[PDB]
C-alpha cells in the first residue's frame, strides 16, 4: 500500500464549517472525484463541539458494548460495530442531515435518495487486520452499472497511519468481473493483486471535522489500531430511494425536523428511547 | 400487428403437469425473455384454478365498482382490482409456480420474490391506454439487466376482440434520456422511433396460460369490445434488493407460503384480509 502524510490533492474538497453549499465548479470536481476514484475527502466541515459530544458518547458506551456475551466484530478481532446514541441531545442536523453532503447525494443518486444508516465502528488498540472487501454489492454480477450508494463516514478522532486509518482502493468500486467477490463482500486475492499492480490501495490521515464520502462498492480494510486509544467513526449510507433497507430508529422528539426535510432519512419514529446497544 | 395465436417465437407449449423445464427448454425460454422481454407459456393452470378465481373476481366486481372512487389504469375501463386472499382461493401452483420461479431464479436470482398479488377487470367498452412500462428503468440513460419479472395470468380466453395486451417486443432494455414521464408512459418521439424498426404485436392468449415479461416491456390495455369483463391476475416477481410493500396473506397460508424456496414479500395477518380497500388494522 502507498502510506501517505496527507488527504492526495486529487481526492480532496477542503472547506470550514460555514459552507452551507458548493459552488458549482466546486460540485463539478466533488462529482468527478466520486466517478473516477470512488471516494471524497472533505476536510473542516463539522466543528469540533459535534465531533467532541459524539467522541466521548461513543467511548462512555464503550465499556457496556464490551461488556455483552457476544461482541459484534467485523471480520476480525477489534473493529467493533457500535451505534452513536440516538438521543434528542446528540442528534445534530450538520450531521444526519448536511447540506453539503446531500448536495452531492442528490446530484449523484438524486433528489430522493434517502440515508438509512446510522451506524458506527470502534476501532480498538490491538486490532487485526480486515479482508479488502465492498460494504455494499453490484446488483448483478459481471455488470458494470451506476451508483447506488454512496458511505458517509464521520471520524470522530484524527485519524492517523498508526491509530487505523483506513485502508482505500482508489477507482475498485467499477470493478465487477465474475467470481470477484464471496458471500461476505471480500475481493477474492486473484482480483486484489490484479488490481494492485495497476492501481495500488492508498491510507493516509484523516482530521477530526472531516467527511467522508465514498461509493458504497470502493474496495478498501479496516487496519490494526497500533495507539492506546479507541477510534470510532460514526458511518451514515444515502441510498437511492429503490434500495431496500430496514429504517433507521430514531426517537419521535427529533421527527418534527427529520420528517419535515427534503434530505430524506429513511426513518421508524419511536416513542421514548431507543436502545442504540 | 394482429395474430391468430400466440407467435411461435414468444411461446412455450406447457400442460399443467410440467414442473421444471429441461436444461433446453429453459434456455429457450431465457433467450426468449433477454431477446423480446415477453414470455407466453401455454396450458400452465388447470381449468379448475382460473375458473375459481375468474369467479371470485366477477363476484368482488360490484363492491369495487361501489367505491367513491373507483381506480383505474390511465383510462375508463381498465379497473385495478386484487384477487382476494382467502386461503380457499390461495393456489400454490398460482402462488408458488414450480415453472415460473425455475425462470424468475435463472434471470433474477435464487432470492428473487413476488411482491404483488393483483389484477385488471378490462370492462365492456373500455379505452385505449398509452403505452407505458409498469416498473421503470432504475437510472435515466443507462442499460441495464432485468430486476423484475410481471407474471400475467389471463381468467379468460384473451382474444384481439376482448382486449388482449398490446406488447412491444425487445421494447425492455429501451432506455434513452427523456423517453419516460412521471406514469411511465413512453414519449410519443420514442414510440414511433421504435414502431419503425420493432412494431408492437396483439394476440390471443388461451385461459391456462401464464405470461412471463420484463417489468419495464412497453405494453397498453386496449378496448374491450366483447359483452363481458375481461380479468387478468398479475403477480410480480423482483430482486430481492428492490423495495417494495409486502403482500398481505392470512397467516393460514403461513405455514406453505413461508416454508418455500420460492420467496413472497408476504406480511401474515390474524385474521381474514380486505383485498379491495387494505383496511385491515395492523
Ligand atoms: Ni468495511
Ligand atoms: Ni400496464
Known sequence: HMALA????????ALTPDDKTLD????????????????????????????DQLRTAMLDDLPEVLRQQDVPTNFVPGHVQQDPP????????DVLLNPVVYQITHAVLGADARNA????????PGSHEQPVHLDEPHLWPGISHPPYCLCVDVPLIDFTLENGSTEYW????????????????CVLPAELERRRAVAPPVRFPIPVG????????????????????????????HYTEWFDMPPIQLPDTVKSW????????????????????
Open 24 to 51: 458549482p465548479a466546486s460540485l463539478d470536481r466533488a462529482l468527478a472525484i466520486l466517478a473516477e476514484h470512488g471516494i471524497l475527502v472533505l476536510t473542516g466541515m463539522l466543528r469540533t463541539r459535534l465531533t
Open 258 to 277: 427529520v420528517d419535515g426535510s427534503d434530505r430524506h432519512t429513511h426513518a421508524h419514529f419511536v416513542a421514548g428511547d431507543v436502545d442504540h446497544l
Open 117 to 124: 444508516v446510522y451506524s458506527g465502528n470502534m476501532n480498538l
Open 6 to 13: 496527507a488527504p492526495p490533492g486529487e481526492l480532496t474538497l
Open 210 to 237: 472531516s467527511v467522508v464520502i465514498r461509493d458504497g462498492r470502493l474496495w478498501h480494510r479496516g487496519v490494526p489500531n497500533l495507539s492506546a486509544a479507541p477510534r470510532p467513526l460514526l458511518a451514515m449510507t
Open 170 to 185: 482508489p477507482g475498485s468500486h467499477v470493478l465487477n468481473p465474475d467470481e470477484c467477490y464471496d458471500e461476505r463482500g
Open 86 to 93: 440516538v438521543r434528542e441531545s446528540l442528534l445534530f442536523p
